[PDB]
């Protein structure tokens, strides 16, 4: 069973730079039976390389393939914001096996989050639930802190969140935080705030609404 | 042609030799007349002479 | 030549190949120079190349015959392609298996 080990786990480089990805195999694999794939969040894998160095139809020449035996390489000569994806190696000398993947991040000039806050709708509140939303929009890096305050009191154990993957055109991230209270608990309080800490902020940002 | 074993395990190579029914069949598939197959290693030696004849 | 086995039992064909002492002996007995003997079935394959050369003198002869055997199953067919040097089979032995053996002894049977 040929094991494919990729290096590094995560790679972060700015546009114009060269990316080097490595693949290590448990068996000597002939270089005429090895492929490389690109997978952008939610898409199907795109064949980049086949036969270790043969470029697939519709692939840019900045994508270069190399290697032999157990040591294989993918080189991306000139990074674009569009190259933010996971890369995979595959051997096809025996029944096809693939690597664990390499996540390539494109660097961007530090961007502060455009922060928004949304109250629960009357329609929702009629169900017995009061969910409160906070949006951090178009920022870089992905690291960001979100704190929920109810009458200026830090909540915890109720706040779920998720983040979109790096934008393939502008390389930014966005974050959705959801404070889920009950209607009854929502109605015990009146001040709802979302505090955001981030690299592009010289000081923390707070957005809020009142009522009730 | 050689094929070197640089792995940590033994390789098993399965191969064969074709013996034509006629001499015409020989030269059509392999220009050259009945010749030899020699498969050698540092431990083994395997020579096969093709024998043409109706099967 | 073929010889098809259409009986209910296995046939045993005993045959051989003659290897001459000289090249003159080859061409006198078989015009053609050293050629091949191919005895094939649907299970077996037996190719023999005659090798001409001086052998040990046995009763007038400095040559020798190699003996080979073949079993042909029911539905199988004995097929002999030979370009010469064939010591042909005249037929077959009916071959089975059972309370049958062989022993070496000089004991008097009584």
């Amino acid at each position: 069973d040929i094991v494919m080990t990729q290096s590094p786990g995560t790679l972060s480089l700015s546009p114009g730079e060269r990316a080097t990805l490595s693949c290590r195999t448990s068996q000597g694999v002939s270089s005429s039976y090895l492929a490389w794939y690109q997978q952008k969040p939610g898409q199907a894998p795109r064949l980049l390389i086949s036969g270790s160095s043969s470029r697939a139809t519709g692939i840019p020449d900045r994508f270069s393939g190399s290697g032999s035996g157990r040591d294989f390489t993918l080189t991306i000569s000139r990074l674009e914001p569009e190259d933010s994806a996971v890369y995979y190696c595959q051997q096809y000398a025996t029944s096809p096996t693939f690597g664990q993947g390499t996540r390539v991040e494109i660097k961007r000039t530090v961007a502060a989050p455009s922060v928004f806050i949304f109250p629960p709708s009357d329609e929702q509140l009629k169900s017995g639930t009061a969910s409160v939303v906070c949006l951090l929009n178009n920022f870089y890096p992905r690291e960001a802190k979100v704190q929920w305050k109810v009458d200026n009191a830090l909540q915890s154990g109720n706040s779920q969140e998720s983040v979109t993957e790096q934008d393939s055109k502008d390389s930014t991230y966005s974050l959705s935080s959801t404070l889920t209270l009950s209607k009854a608990d929502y109605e015990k309080h009146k001040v709802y705030a979302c505090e955001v800490t981030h690299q592009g902020l010289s000081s923390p940002v707070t957005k809020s609404f009142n009522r009730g | 042609v050689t094929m070197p074993n640089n792995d940590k395990f033994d390789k098993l190579y399965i191969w064969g030799v074709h013996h034509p029914g006629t001499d015409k069949d020989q030269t059509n598939l392999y220009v050259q007349a009945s010749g030899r197959v020699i498969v050698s290693t540092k431990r083994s030696q395997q020579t096969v002479i093709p024998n043409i004849g109706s099967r | 030549v073929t010889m098809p086995n259409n009986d209910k039992f296995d046939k045993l064909y005993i045959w051989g190949v003659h290897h001459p002492g000289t090249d003159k002996d080859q061409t006198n007995l078989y015009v053609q120079a050293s050629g091949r003997v191919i005895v094939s079935t649907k299970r077996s394959q037996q190719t023999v190349i005659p090798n001409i050369g001086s052998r040990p003198w046995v009763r007038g002869v400095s040559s020798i015959i190699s003996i080979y055997w073949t079993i042909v199953k029911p539905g199988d067919i004995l097929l002999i392609n030979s370009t010469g040097n064939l010591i042909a089979p005249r037929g077959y032995f009916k071959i089975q298996s059972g309370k049958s053996s062989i022993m070496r002894s000089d004991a008097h049977i009584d």
Partner: protein, 55 residues
């Protein structure tokens, strides 16, 4: 123990790559089971040392 039903293939047909044995490519077994119903459907071949190879 992991059983592999040979079905209409023999172990050697599965090895060599007889077209109706493509399902056996790269398979494993603790016990390979040969059926009497098995057949071959490819070029005529002879494996001298058949029994050794199968084993």
């Amino acid at each position: 123990h992991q059983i592999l039903d040979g079905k209409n293939c023999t172990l050697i047909d599965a090895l060599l790559g007889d077209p109706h044995c493509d399902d056996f490519q790269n398979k494993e077994w603790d016990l390979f089971v040969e059926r009497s119903t098995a057949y071959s459907n490819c070029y005529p071949y002879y494996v001298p040392d058949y029994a050794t190879l199968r084993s």
